[PDB]
Amino acid sequence: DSDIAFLIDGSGSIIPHDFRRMKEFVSTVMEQLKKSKTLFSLMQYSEEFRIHFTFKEFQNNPNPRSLVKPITQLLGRTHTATGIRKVVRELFNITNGARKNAFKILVVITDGEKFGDPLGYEDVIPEADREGVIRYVIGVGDAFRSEKSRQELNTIASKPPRDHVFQVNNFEALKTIQNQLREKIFA
Template sequence: MWSLLLSVQLLASCSSIALWPGAEGTTAADVVFLLDGSGSVRAKQFSVMKTFVKNLTRSLLEFNTSFAFAQYSIETIIHVNFHQFQRTGWENQVDSISQRRGRTYTADAIKTVVEELFDSSAGARPDAHRILIVLTDGKSDDASSYPNVTAQADGKNITRYAIGIGGAFSSPSAQEELRSIASSPDHVFKVDSFEALDNISSRLVKSIVFTEDSSLLCHPLPFNYTLHGLVFVPERMSWVEALHHCAERGSRLLHILDSCTQVRVEELLAMVALHRGCVEKAWVGLERCMINPHAPWEWSGGAVVGHYQRWSPSFPHKPCCFHCGQLLQEGAAPGQEHRTYRWQDACCREKLPFICAPANGTQPCQT
């Protein structure tokens, strides 16, 4: 259903490794998640870590990606290699991973992944960009082996991300260990707890999808951008034209029914901003009856706007003659990495970019 909407095309002349499907001049990516299954990770924390892995996989799945999943403690277990990854059953594959417990041999785990997963026998694609995401909650028992195994990974051109979880990484030596794992300082992420993992999802996705020498150097072209199943269409149309555009492609103008969808929209627009500059306004599926100035606001299709609402402080702007709803950019709050958006009434004839979503609703948020 999304075949006409999913691609973000970049200039063919760019030496890009951005992960857009079918984009000429780009490449695929093979991604390995290496989970910490050691005894210091509690069962509930391991479950939260798996949810984070699923959320991140879901964000990257719509690109030209393939995935593998492994965990480490005193030994490394490969649960799913690239051959075994199921694009329609992968969530069950992650859910079925059981924690092994034991001591923490992170360097040995990286060595196993480099030798056994990033290999054609495991389904790794020869021309794909190689990405390893290591999650750890503490210092390893074999840190002295990092120079050898990271050199081995560099020899296979594997981009490595290190995610340190919890207070163990407050010390300088522990932070140095994270830097040893990662390919560069920009690929080190730290969170205070497992529950805070989702706070870095947006930055991590953007770091993976865009590199400093990739699509950021391309001139923006009028093609579509997608994240979380939401599709930003930069072509400017009236609200009715945008409504028909989405419908003709089996989707609908976006309905924002909860805070999770609002966050996903803002992550999508932050991603678009990396290519095109900030998006000031965009159509969503808000509308109101034109002949009744007191009619309630609805989502296209007739559902009255419910409990979740995020109207601009200046709403309504012109209740007498504005009957369609847009997202209106606000400034970034202190400590936020991207700008926020509020809902605002607008003239339906105005030409704006817009956001389409699956006709059956957005993907459910994982808790």
């Protein structure tokens, strides 16, 4: 029914406590959204990319908190474009447990503008729309409190941005967006 992936920014700018707050938020959202026909998957990215759980592994152990708890920060830069390409191509791959015909959803959480990435969003976004992946993005912190940086949030997110883009001042404020995300996803 619904294949919901998460692409979480694990860059060096996110101090340890904010990283745990992001893990608390993902656990909470996954728990609130869990239904028999919903599988979840997660990838963390910096300048490195790590699949923490595939849809298959989540199906065999549908416990968000036990799957998320052990996750450790990758540190490094922010290769957001490459992160979404690997999500589209690997996370939503049938061999990883994705269900053909399922609604494909991706929730991106980042605290900074893409930097150092060899790929541009122009190399990644069109393929994502072609594969049907609906995208939500949550921009956290200072990196996104200007009009210019918000455009990047819009570029990542599905149309219209007003329905798929969330900005929150700090990782502590993520909890302020929990209900809206869930209800946007459910709708």
